[PDB]
Amino acid sequence: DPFTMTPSEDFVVTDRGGIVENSHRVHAAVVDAKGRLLYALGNPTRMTLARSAAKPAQALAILETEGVAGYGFDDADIALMCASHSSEDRHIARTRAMLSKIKAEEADLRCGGHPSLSEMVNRSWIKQDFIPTAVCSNCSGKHVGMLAGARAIGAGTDGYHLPDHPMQGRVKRTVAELCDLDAGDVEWGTDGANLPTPAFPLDRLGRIYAKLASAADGSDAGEGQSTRCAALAHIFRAMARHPEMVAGEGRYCTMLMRAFDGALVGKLGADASYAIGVRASDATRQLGTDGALGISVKIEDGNLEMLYAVVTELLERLGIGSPDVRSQLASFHHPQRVNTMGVTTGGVSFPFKLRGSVDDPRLAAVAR
Amino acid sequence: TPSEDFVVTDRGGIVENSHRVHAAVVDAKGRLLYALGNPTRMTLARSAAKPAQALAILETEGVAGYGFDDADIALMCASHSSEDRHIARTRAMLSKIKAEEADLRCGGHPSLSEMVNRSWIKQDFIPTAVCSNCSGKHVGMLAGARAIGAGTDGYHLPDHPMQGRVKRTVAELCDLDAGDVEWGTDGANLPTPAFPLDRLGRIYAKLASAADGSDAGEGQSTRCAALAHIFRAMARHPEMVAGEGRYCTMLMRAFDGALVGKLGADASYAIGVRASDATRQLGTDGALGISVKIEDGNLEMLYAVVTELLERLGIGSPDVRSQLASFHHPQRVNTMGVTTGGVSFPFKLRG
């Protein structure tokens, strides 16, 4: 029944010859630069672990640490602070170069190695029986930045990753401020790189990225900016200018940001969250706002392949990009379902319904 | 109305992911005894259908003369890890029917075992037909095609008499009309069935009930004798059904003949349990079947949920189920060795 559809029915579905295989619940928030909710799927205020999608906020805490500017980190270094990189040789090399800029060593890192986020890098490692180390961590740029901040303020570098260290105090305050939340409304766990990692309502992730894009708009327009806005604009520019540092070859975040050529930044969070900050455009004005826009997405069950398909579908429904721009992402939008003998067996579909654009006022949209 | 039954992962007590669970526990006639979620969800059984496909093979006139043994039949029932021993038995079965790898109509794929696949990657190995996790099923279907003098070139096609026999056998074991079983195509390019989840449990209840009847000396039909043989082969050679470290293998070794279990791709699972003190305590005088589907397809959550279900149902002892402890509560340890989270089962079995 099309007239009683509900957020609880916002799904992405795979089929085999039209027979339902798996279904996945979708949550999404589309917000303006003040965080006002414009469109939604599912529960747009779902309490959600932002995971690596919080990295631009952590990079802001690093860059706002007094004395860090003296080290001379460049745009590509800042993009690596914002990264879940593929541990390609260039990412490892830049990690070592950043360590040298602050006169630190690999032994000072408090993150550990892991199989590469890229299948192609991991195959190269498997062939050589290579055991990844701390400098290979996908979070290595963030950790070097945290070490840099600890050094700059005269804190111990031992324990820079611990919650009671001033660098983590700065991270926690900065995240809550960008979300416009009280501290008690942000919850904290520990991530794979052994750092505090925040959870907050999903729409506030979109809000962080709308603020990134809004700051970039203000910088480009030559507006006088606060130190924080200037730093957010710098983070946006660094990500857009060096998207290969943010992920790597063949990675969604990199291909997305290259396709859009400065129009937006995007960032993956582990267990299938995603965030995009969109500079003001004809597309954002058609969506009903006079400034920048933020988008955040969570697949409830954590499936990454479905995440990238949904994010690409959502950009199409929001009219962001062109068919030609979004077509660089076609392999993510409709994932291949080809069996071992080259026969297509099924596909992906998107039975979810954006709300916010309509319906009988008696139709309740219960966030679920 | 189906309950809202979930398995939930957390990071420091904060919800990470949640996964909807469907499950059916049925008696030997398929009557529903316990459920999670929607126990009749229309579900692609995928490889959990392989014992029914093995039955169609074993019931084919002339197949007995090839001399397939228990380990061969276990391989027909397998989603194996493509270990060297699985490939070697595939080749040995091809030799029994005087066929070649080129006669197979399945293709190679990365191993279901990450350890095997890493070993292949290190050695630049390109898997071929004989490495398919379904290779034993395909040899069996080739064997059946040969046995009745049908063409072998298209034994995998829907209009071939081997697939006619498979389709009829699946619906008969489900106790469904032909029109109530839907069909797609699987990764190995064979027809693969969808039917209500509880009927998958019914198939495995019939497997275990047949083993109970053969064990007790009852006048069994030929079909029941064949089902008992399939159960015996899987429980005797569980390493052929999956492989080292695989859930199905560790599950069946732990239970030492008390049950058989089988994975279906995209996170279905089926178990047939022979009558026991545990099944009698559950209120049935015969064998039992269990089938599970994780709605979003997550395998790690599947194995955690199945093990939690065995615990709720009292199936096995604590000591026996502790062999599956690593699947029941999967590791959540970061790159520096710190535990960051866990898994929870806020569902409740309804009876």
XYZ file of C-alpha atoms in Angstrom:
719
model
C 0.000 0.000 0.000
C 1.771 3.160 -1.224
C -0.260 5.441 1.016
C 0.807 3.895 4.318
C 4.591 3.603 3.784
C 6.708 4.193 6.887
C 10.325 4.778 7.930
C 10.353 1.219 9.272
C 10.067 0.124 5.619
C 13.152 2.004 4.352
C 15.203 -0.867 2.928
C 17.877 -1.803 0.425
C 17.273 -5.331 -0.878
C 19.163 -7.904 -2.903
C 17.375 -10.521 -4.955
C 18.211 -13.719 -6.822
C 15.995 -14.070 -9.882
C 13.458 -11.765 -8.210
C 13.419 -13.811 -4.974
C 14.397 -11.755 -1.914
C 17.842 -12.720 -0.640
C 18.834 -10.153 2.038
C 17.282 -6.900 3.215
C 19.004 -4.071 5.052
C 17.489 -1.169 6.976
C 18.593 2.325 5.979
C 18.810 5.476 8.144
C 19.686 8.845 6.681
C 19.632 12.537 7.477
C 19.929 15.499 5.123
C 20.498 18.753 7.034
C 21.211 22.403 6.306
C 24.232 24.318 7.626
C 22.505 24.938 10.983
C 21.491 21.301 11.305
C 17.825 21.768 10.413
C 16.521 18.446 9.115
C 15.491 18.667 5.443
C 15.034 15.036 4.364
C 15.262 11.646 6.029
C 15.177 7.878 5.754
C 14.573 5.538 8.625
C 15.482 7.139 11.968
C 17.528 10.282 11.184
C 18.358 10.743 14.905
C 19.540 7.180 15.540
C 22.282 7.134 18.162
C 25.207 6.076 15.968
C 28.913 5.387 16.342
C 30.409 7.770 13.784
C 33.661 5.763 13.754
C 36.058 7.068 11.093
C 33.433 9.537 9.852
C 34.338 11.568 12.934
C 37.933 12.040 11.710
C 37.456 15.594 10.260
C 36.268 16.687 13.730
C 39.309 15.068 15.310
C 41.525 16.758 12.714
C 39.966 20.079 13.736
C 40.926 19.396 17.351
C 44.507 18.683 16.190
C 44.745 21.801 14.019
C 43.299 23.977 16.790
C 45.947 22.759 19.230
C 48.218 25.733 19.886
C 51.647 25.189 18.380
C 50.695 22.554 15.814
C 50.902 25.062 12.942
C 54.652 25.282 13.558
C 55.264 21.728 12.321
C 54.335 22.676 8.756
C 51.807 19.969 7.971
C 50.603 20.486 4.397
C 47.207 19.834 2.769
C 48.053 16.222 1.945
C 49.155 15.603 5.562
C 45.853 17.030 6.807
C 43.968 14.830 4.348
C 45.818 11.882 5.900
C 44.726 12.993 9.362
C 41.196 12.737 7.962
C 41.835 9.300 6.358
C 40.865 5.642 6.620
C 43.603 4.976 4.145
C 44.373 1.780 2.207
C 47.932 1.505 3.603
C 49.365 1.997 0.145
C 53.082 2.728 0.097
C 52.355 6.451 -0.351
C 50.240 6.479 2.829
C 52.972 4.749 4.802
C 55.590 7.110 3.362
C 53.547 10.190 4.312
C 53.027 8.830 7.844
C 56.804 8.546 8.238
C 57.272 12.047 6.779
C 54.753 13.438 9.295
C 56.544 11.627 12.135
C 59.806 13.238 10.999
C 58.165 16.681 10.974
C 57.415 16.309 14.699
C 60.654 14.422 15.535
C 58.803 11.261 16.648
C 59.264 7.575 15.865
C 57.037 4.689 14.817
C 57.477 3.329 18.354
C 55.581 6.394 19.660
C 52.400 5.406 17.818
C 49.723 3.754 19.930
C 47.821 2.206 16.982
C 48.470 -1.237 15.580
C 48.660 -2.891 12.198
C 45.789 -4.674 10.461
C 44.957 -6.229 7.081
C 44.677 -3.501 4.490
C 41.279 -1.970 3.744
C 42.204 -2.512 0.059
C 42.039 -6.034 -1.365
C 44.812 -5.149 -3.848
C 47.234 -3.883 -1.190
C 46.421 -6.869 0.975
C 47.237 -9.245 -1.881
C 50.655 -7.591 -2.255
C 51.223 -8.037 1.482
C 50.106 -11.691 1.479
C 52.532 -12.533 -1.307
C 55.461 -11.230 0.784
C 54.261 -12.576 4.170
C 54.402 -8.928 5.271
C 53.152 -8.297 8.808
C 51.686 -4.768 9.017
C 52.834 -2.569 11.883
C 51.666 0.642 13.590
C 52.806 2.910 10.763
C 50.495 0.937 8.411
C 47.322 1.576 10.404
C 44.516 3.166 8.397
C 44.349 5.734 11.237
C 48.086 6.429 11.224
C 47.675 10.078 10.114
C 45.244 10.830 12.947
C 47.605 9.261 15.459
C 50.569 11.308 14.225
C 48.404 14.431 14.501
C 47.447 13.533 18.081
C 51.102 12.983 18.933
C 51.876 16.358 17.352
C 49.269 18.056 19.512
C 50.496 16.347 22.680
C 54.063 17.508 21.971
C 53.036 21.053 21.096
C 51.254 21.704 24.401
C 53.911 20.027 26.559
C 51.816 17.058 27.601
C 53.344 13.636 27.812
C 53.283 11.737 24.549
C 52.886 8.628 26.596
C 49.170 8.143 26.879
C 48.152 10.624 24.161
C 45.457 8.145 23.164
C 43.944 7.833 26.689
C 40.675 9.592 27.640
C 42.242 11.621 30.471
C 44.971 13.053 28.228
C 44.394 16.726 27.255
C 44.475 15.782 23.582
C 41.495 13.493 24.107
C 39.844 16.173 26.272
C 40.170 18.508 23.297
C 38.735 15.897 20.929
C 35.702 15.302 23.146
C 34.927 19.005 23.593
C 35.403 19.681 19.851
C 33.099 16.842 18.744
C 30.333 17.979 21.057
C 30.738 21.597 19.966
C 30.537 20.742 16.257
C 27.427 18.639 16.959
C 25.952 21.478 19.078
C 25.411 18.900 21.851
C 26.040 18.917 25.560
C 28.867 16.581 26.556
C 26.425 14.143 28.177
C 24.647 13.637 24.838
C 27.814 12.257 23.167
C 28.769 8.707 24.191
C 32.260 7.233 23.856
C 33.667 3.814 23.054
C 37.099 2.643 21.843
C 37.939 2.166 18.158
C 40.138 -0.336 16.295
C 43.119 2.024 16.554
C 42.711 2.143 20.385
C 41.362 5.785 20.561
C 38.131 7.196 22.069
C 35.391 7.197 19.389
C 32.064 9.077 19.689
C 28.409 8.127 19.241
C 25.740 10.779 18.736
C 22.479 11.171 16.796
C 22.959 10.481 13.098
C 21.706 13.903 11.993
C 24.514 15.577 13.945
C 27.034 13.732 11.781
C 25.369 15.382 8.805
C 25.582 18.661 10.728
C 29.377 18.340 11.123
C 29.779 17.905 7.380
C 27.370 20.736 6.519
C 29.592 22.942 8.678
C 32.688 21.755 6.768
C 31.124 22.642 3.443
C 29.675 25.910 4.775
C 33.114 27.000 5.954
C 34.575 26.185 2.544
C 31.871 28.343 0.955
C 32.733 31.241 3.272
C 36.456 30.923 2.612
C 35.997 30.825 -1.182
C 33.704 33.872 -0.959
C 36.304 35.826 1.024
C 34.162 36.279 4.152
C 35.861 37.141 7.424
C 35.987 33.883 9.431
C 36.608 32.726 12.973
C 39.709 30.643 13.549
C 37.456 27.573 13.750
C 35.694 28.291 10.475
C 39.046 28.950 8.769
C 40.285 25.570 10.010
C 37.120 23.767 8.864
C 37.554 25.319 5.419
C 41.146 24.105 5.382
C 40.078 20.550 6.252
C 37.448 20.572 3.505
C 39.970 21.857 0.945
C 42.610 19.322 1.996
C 40.192 16.390 1.659
C 38.934 17.590 -1.724
C 42.417 18.301 -3.064
C 43.980 15.010 -1.912
C 41.138 12.496 -1.854
C 43.597 9.664 -2.482
C 45.061 10.361 0.981
C 41.593 10.017 2.530
C 41.182 6.451 1.220
C 43.123 5.226 -1.822
C 42.937 3.827 -5.315
C 39.611 2.249 -6.126
C 38.091 3.336 -2.801
C 34.605 4.867 -2.708
C 35.617 8.042 -0.827
C 38.402 8.733 -3.299
C 36.360 8.030 -6.426
C 33.436 10.060 -5.048
C 35.528 13.130 -4.259
C 37.448 12.960 -7.535
C 34.207 12.713 -9.529
C 32.785 15.795 -7.809
C 36.005 17.831 -8.214
C 35.590 20.056 -5.157
C 31.784 20.151 -4.938
C 31.660 17.937 -1.833
C 33.706 15.830 0.574
C 32.747 12.370 1.765
C 34.015 9.992 4.427
C 33.388 6.376 5.388
C 32.732 5.176 8.932
C 33.336 1.527 9.789
C 30.266 -0.688 10.198
C 28.571 1.171 7.355
C 28.160 4.860 8.135
C 28.858 7.629 5.621
C 28.916 11.416 5.730
C 28.984 14.011 2.913
C 29.339 17.810 3.072
C 27.987 19.578 -0.036
C 28.929 23.151 -0.942
C 26.050 25.454 -1.908
C 24.933 24.795 -5.482
C 21.954 24.810 -7.803
C 21.263 21.310 -6.427
C 21.224 22.415 -2.780
C 18.979 25.380 -3.631
C 16.563 23.061 -5.434
C 16.471 20.994 -2.224
C 15.258 24.077 -0.351
C 18.244 25.608 1.484
C 20.264 28.749 0.817
C 23.573 27.372 2.139
C 25.572 24.190 2.326
C 24.139 20.763 3.091
C 25.150 17.675 5.029
C 24.196 14.035 4.478
C 24.685 11.119 6.876
C 23.744 7.455 6.356
C 23.850 4.300 8.477
C 23.040 0.737 7.324
C 21.611 -0.836 10.457
C 23.300 -4.234 10.002
C 26.671 -2.745 8.988
C 26.969 -4.016 5.385
C 29.512 -1.873 3.464
C 28.553 -2.955 -0.058
C 24.979 -1.888 0.647
C 26.188 1.381 2.176
C 27.954 2.478 -1.013
C 24.964 1.469 -3.159
C 22.573 3.449 -0.932
C 24.776 6.563 -0.745
C 25.055 6.656 -4.539
C 21.282 6.176 -4.918
C 20.629 8.939 -2.399
C 22.843 11.389 -4.303
C 20.837 10.575 -7.442
C 17.531 11.142 -5.654
C 18.799 14.448 -4.258
C 19.930 15.542 -7.717
C 23.517 16.047 -6.551
C 25.926 15.782 -9.430
C 25.204 14.937 -13.004
C 24.556 11.490 -14.495
C 28.069 11.841 -15.964
C 29.584 12.736 -12.591
C 27.775 10.011 -10.702
C 28.538 7.416 -13.431
C 32.125 7.017 -12.124
C 30.325 5.332 -9.187
C 28.144 2.963 -11.249
C 29.991 -0.126 -9.972
C 29.008 0.834 -6.419
C 25.488 1.996 -7.232
C 24.395 -1.380 -8.678
C 26.807 -4.017 -7.341
C 27.655 -6.883 -9.669
C 25.827 -10.170 -9.016
C 27.627 -12.477 -11.482
C 28.126 -16.163 -10.680
C 31.208 -18.290 -11.290
C 30.161 -19.016 -14.878
C 29.571 -15.346 -15.824
C 25.779 -15.380 -15.470
C 24.029 -12.514 -13.688
C 21.856 -14.006 -10.922
C 20.237 -11.011 -9.257
C 20.638 -7.417 -8.294
C 20.066 -4.605 -5.822
C 16.944 -2.510 -5.359
C 16.065 0.500 -3.219
C 12.560 0.257 -1.664
C 13.003 3.255 0.589
C 11.226 6.598 0.327
C 12.772 9.968 1.068
C 10.563 12.071 3.327
C 10.672 15.864 3.701
C 9.886 17.028 0.123
C 2.711 15.464 0.046
C 1.137 12.732 2.269
C -2.152 12.666 4.167
C -1.503 14.460 7.506
C -2.818 11.335 9.246
C 0.140 9.266 8.054
C 2.571 9.086 10.988
C 6.295 8.949 10.210
C 7.587 7.135 13.266
C 11.382 7.280 13.277
C 12.501 3.621 13.226
C 2.577 -11.630 14.323
C 6.321 -12.327 14.174
C 8.253 -10.888 17.099
C 11.016 -8.314 16.713
C 13.904 -10.691 17.380
C 17.431 -9.264 17.013
C 21.061 -10.084 17.626
C 22.898 -6.878 18.524
C 26.574 -5.907 18.594
C 27.878 -3.152 20.802
C 31.004 -1.074 21.225
C 31.449 -0.199 24.873
C 27.731 -0.797 25.461
C 26.803 1.497 22.547
C 24.768 -0.231 19.810
C 26.830 -0.783 16.696
C 24.817 -3.087 14.404
C 21.610 -5.047 14.805
C 20.467 -8.040 12.787
C 16.956 -9.480 12.463
C 16.761 -13.215 13.190
C 14.244 -15.720 11.816
C 14.160 -19.272 13.132
C 11.948 -22.357 13.107
C 12.200 -25.404 15.366
C 10.041 -28.226 14.010
C 9.247 -31.833 14.839
C 9.689 -34.798 12.496
C 6.405 -34.071 10.662
C 7.274 -30.355 10.376
C 4.955 -29.089 13.096
C 6.311 -25.842 14.469
C 7.508 -26.101 18.086
C 9.499 -22.866 18.640
C 10.162 -19.748 16.574
C 12.078 -16.493 16.286
C 11.023 -13.767 13.899
C 8.978 -15.050 10.948
C 9.399 -18.861 10.952
C 7.695 -19.135 7.520
C 9.736 -16.427 5.744
C 10.191 -17.283 2.067
C 13.912 -18.102 1.987
C 16.551 -19.169 -0.529
C 17.970 -22.304 1.076
C 21.098 -22.080 -1.104
C 23.620 -24.738 -0.024
C 21.404 -25.795 2.884
C 19.386 -27.609 0.182
C 22.339 -29.869 -0.705
C 21.221 -32.955 1.296
C 17.960 -32.893 -0.692
C 19.926 -32.598 -3.916
C 22.152 -35.484 -2.739
C 18.989 -37.527 -2.228
C 17.962 -36.914 -5.850
C 21.426 -38.074 -6.955
C 21.420 -41.203 -4.766
C 17.914 -42.130 -5.897
C 18.922 -42.041 -9.557
C 18.873 -45.440 -11.243
C 22.364 -46.840 -11.676
C 24.200 -44.389 -9.398
C 24.804 -47.168 -6.861
C 27.142 -48.901 -9.297
C 29.697 -46.095 -9.249
C 30.655 -47.098 -5.712
C 30.512 -43.696 -4.032
C 31.473 -44.047 -0.356
C 30.423 -42.135 2.768
C 33.083 -39.459 2.358
C 32.059 -38.957 -1.280
C 28.437 -38.489 -0.236
C 29.521 -35.992 2.418
C 31.240 -34.056 -0.338
C 28.025 -34.050 -2.405
C 26.432 -32.443 0.675
C 29.271 -29.906 1.110
C 30.098 -26.219 0.867
C 33.700 -27.154 1.283
C 36.655 -24.813 1.838
C 38.448 -26.016 -1.316
C 41.208 -27.569 0.754
C 43.625 -29.768 -1.170
C 41.832 -32.856 0.225
C 38.458 -31.616 -1.082
C 39.930 -31.115 -4.549
C 41.565 -34.535 -4.427
C 38.273 -36.233 -3.528
C 36.518 -34.309 -6.308
C 39.059 -35.723 -8.760
C 38.653 -39.214 -7.271
C 34.879 -38.991 -7.765
C 35.311 -37.836 -11.378
C 37.492 -40.907 -11.908
C 34.744 -43.173 -10.530
C 32.310 -41.982 -13.215
C 34.989 -41.794 -15.970
C 34.531 -38.024 -16.334
C 37.004 -35.121 -16.534
C 37.157 -31.651 -14.981
C 36.087 -30.210 -18.360
C 32.720 -31.946 -17.903
C 31.969 -29.876 -14.775
C 29.614 -26.920 -15.279
C 30.620 -24.989 -12.113
C 33.355 -22.353 -11.886
C 36.123 -21.449 -9.485
C 35.828 -18.790 -6.810
C 37.838 -17.471 -3.862
C 37.892 -20.043 -1.087
C 35.225 -19.971 1.630
C 38.175 -20.240 4.067
C 40.161 -17.007 4.361
C 43.237 -19.037 5.343
C 42.972 -21.158 2.188
C 42.336 -18.105 0.053
C 45.412 -16.373 1.501
C 47.475 -19.441 0.625
C 46.102 -19.316 -2.941
C 46.874 -15.586 -3.252
C 50.453 -16.129 -2.080
C 50.885 -18.751 -4.838
C 49.104 -16.863 -7.652
C 46.588 -19.698 -7.837
C 43.541 -19.287 -10.096
C 40.743 -21.612 -8.906
C 39.082 -23.799 -11.531
C 35.911 -25.891 -11.729
C 37.248 -28.690 -9.531
C 37.829 -26.143 -6.699
C 34.189 -25.046 -6.526
C 32.726 -25.431 -3.027
C 29.866 -27.223 -4.819
C 32.167 -29.532 -6.828
C 30.906 -32.697 -5.116
C 27.272 -31.865 -5.907
C 28.216 -31.233 -9.530
C 30.079 -34.532 -9.855
C 27.028 -36.217 -8.369
C 24.704 -34.614 -10.880
C 27.051 -35.546 -13.712
C 27.018 -39.086 -12.326
C 23.228 -39.171 -12.325
C 23.033 -37.825 -15.883
C 25.453 -40.544 -17.059
C 23.677 -43.219 -15.048
C 20.367 -42.818 -16.875
C 21.993 -42.178 -20.236
C 21.010 -38.531 -20.431
C 23.279 -35.977 -22.038
C 26.018 -34.705 -19.771
C 26.672 -31.384 -21.516
C 23.633 -29.702 -19.932
C 23.101 -31.629 -16.674
C 22.859 -28.272 -14.875
C 20.033 -26.822 -17.019
C 16.433 -26.666 -15.738
C 15.091 -28.745 -18.676
C 17.535 -31.624 -18.053
C 16.047 -34.736 -16.364
C 18.571 -34.461 -13.484
C 17.202 -31.040 -12.592
C 13.664 -32.354 -13.019
C 14.475 -34.993 -10.402
C 16.071 -32.404 -8.105
C 13.057 -30.083 -8.338
C 10.590 -32.880 -7.633
C 12.681 -34.229 -4.708
C 12.996 -30.824 -3.007
C 9.250 -30.211 -3.154
C 8.517 -33.747 -1.901
C 10.820 -33.370 1.116
C 9.214 -29.994 1.899
C 5.739 -31.524 1.486
C 4.954 -28.663 -0.938
C 3.312 -28.541 -4.334
C 5.698 -27.776 -7.191
C 4.210 -24.309 -7.554
C 5.057 -23.415 -3.940
C 8.803 -23.771 -4.498
C 10.441 -20.880 -6.344
C 13.721 -21.200 -8.210
C 16.670 -18.988 -9.037
C 20.261 -19.709 -10.080
C 23.114 -20.185 -7.596
C 26.824 -19.239 -7.675
C 27.639 -22.600 -9.283
C 25.106 -21.954 -12.080
C 22.560 -24.595 -10.852
C 18.871 -24.125 -10.051
C 18.455 -23.295 -6.383
C 15.168 -23.303 -4.443
C 13.302 -20.894 -2.202
C 10.577 -22.029 0.195
C 9.260 -21.133 3.671
C 11.987 -21.279 6.305
C 10.172 -23.874 8.408
C 10.219 -26.341 5.503
C 14.021 -26.182 5.579
C 13.853 -27.304 9.197
C 11.387 -29.995 8.086
C 13.970 -31.441 5.648
C 16.571 -31.755 8.393
C 14.055 -33.176 10.876
C 13.395 -35.870 8.267
C 17.144 -36.492 7.908
C 17.560 -37.051 11.637
C 14.321 -39.026 11.957
C 15.488 -41.344 9.179
C 18.759 -41.919 11.047
C 16.788 -42.741 14.198
C 14.666 -45.230 12.244
C 17.628 -46.970 10.617
C 19.301 -47.139 14.036
C 16.139 -48.734 15.492
C 15.655 -51.427 12.821
C 12.345 -50.168 11.420
C 10.936 -51.180 8.072
C 12.190 -48.092 6.238
C 11.273 -47.051 2.734
C 14.160 -46.747 0.307
C 13.882 -42.990 0.602
C 14.242 -43.128 4.381
C 17.202 -45.514 4.093
C 18.864 -43.020 1.727
C 18.178 -40.103 4.080
C 19.709 -42.117 6.923
C 22.755 -42.726 4.732
C 23.099 -39.006 4.010
C 22.881 -38.175 7.726
C 25.475 -40.859 8.529
C 27.846 -39.628 5.810
C 27.719 -35.984 6.952
C 28.204 -36.834 10.621
C 30.989 -39.353 9.830
C 32.937 -37.017 7.526
C 32.068 -33.478 8.669
C 35.414 -32.206 7.379
C 34.211 -32.964 3.842
C 31.034 -30.936 4.459
C 33.003 -27.777 5.198
C 36.594 -27.955 6.409
C 39.126 -27.164 9.103
C 37.900 -24.438 11.439
C 34.508 -24.226 9.740
C 31.373 -23.987 11.855
C 29.608 -27.001 10.275
C 32.628 -29.202 10.839
C 33.314 -28.111 14.402
C 29.591 -28.346 15.213
C 29.256 -31.895 13.927
C 32.524 -33.061 15.508
C 31.430 -31.632 18.870
C 28.129 -33.541 18.702
C 29.717 -36.834 17.504
C 26.649 -38.111 15.622
C 23.858 -36.491 17.636
C 23.095 -33.997 14.839
C 24.065 -32.693 11.419
C 24.345 -29.044 10.474
C 24.699 -27.232 7.163
C 25.381 -23.637 6.058
C 23.457 -21.806 3.363
C 25.099 -18.808 1.727
C 23.776 -15.381 2.766
C 23.385 -16.705 6.297
C 20.887 -19.530 6.461
C 21.546 -22.566 8.644
C 19.859 -25.916 9.158
C 20.272 -28.628 11.832
C 18.688 -32.074 12.127
C 18.792 -33.416 15.714
C 18.325 -37.103 16.531
C 15.882 -37.882 19.324
C 17.548 -37.319 22.684
C 16.925 -36.371 26.280
C 17.042 -32.747 25.048
C 14.455 -33.232 22.306
C 12.118 -35.048 24.684
C 12.470 -32.177 27.148
C 11.420 -29.837 24.313
C 8.140 -31.748 24.124
C 8.511 -34.048 21.121
C 8.866 -37.824 20.977
C 10.918 -37.823 17.766
C 13.687 -36.022 15.885
C 13.801 -32.234 15.522
C 14.772 -29.744 12.837
C 16.145 -26.225 13.226
C 16.424 -23.587 10.518
C 17.718 -20.030 10.828
C 18.018 -17.008 8.541
C 19.769 -13.712 9.387
C 17.773 -11.174 7.406
C 20.769 -9.065 6.285
C 22.999 -12.045 5.465
C 25.742 -11.675 8.090
C 27.512 -15.028 8.608
C 29.304 -14.150 11.852
C 25.960 -13.288 13.442
C 24.448 -16.490 12.024
C 26.927 -18.687 13.856
C 26.586 -16.716 17.088
C 22.774 -17.015 16.934
C 22.749 -20.741 16.094
C 25.036 -21.476 19.039
C 22.896 -19.339 21.358
C 19.843 -21.256 20.092
C 21.402 -24.619 20.865
C 22.044 -23.285 24.367
C 18.452 -22.061 24.865
C 17.117 -25.391 23.575
C 19.383 -27.421 25.882
C 20.884 -29.310 22.949
C 24.231 -30.772 23.942
C 25.975 -30.229 27.223
C 27.761 -27.067 28.398
C 31.086 -28.862 27.837
C 30.101 -29.915 24.297
C 28.831 -26.471 23.315
C 31.967 -24.816 24.768
C 33.837 -26.131 21.681
C 31.905 -23.463 19.751
C 32.689 -20.640 22.222
C 34.580 -18.603 19.596
C 31.510 -18.535 17.309
C 29.016 -17.987 20.122
C 30.685 -14.779 21.312
C 32.914 -13.590 18.452
C 36.120 -11.761 19.283
C 35.880 -7.951 19.494
C 39.517 -7.039 20.125
C 41.226 -4.063 18.508
C 44.702 -3.791 16.935
C 46.293 -3.222 20.368
C 44.602 -6.203 22.035
C 41.882 -4.282 23.928
C 38.343 -5.702 24.028
C 36.031 -3.065 22.579
C 32.616 -4.668 22.468
C 30.488 -7.752 22.245
C 27.337 -9.484 21.077
C 23.934 -9.751 22.791
C 20.821 -11.854 22.132
C 17.792 -9.838 23.244
C 15.464 -12.237 21.441
C 13.132 -14.718 23.151
C 12.068 -18.077 21.753
C 8.334 -18.304 21.462
C 6.679 -21.676 21.772
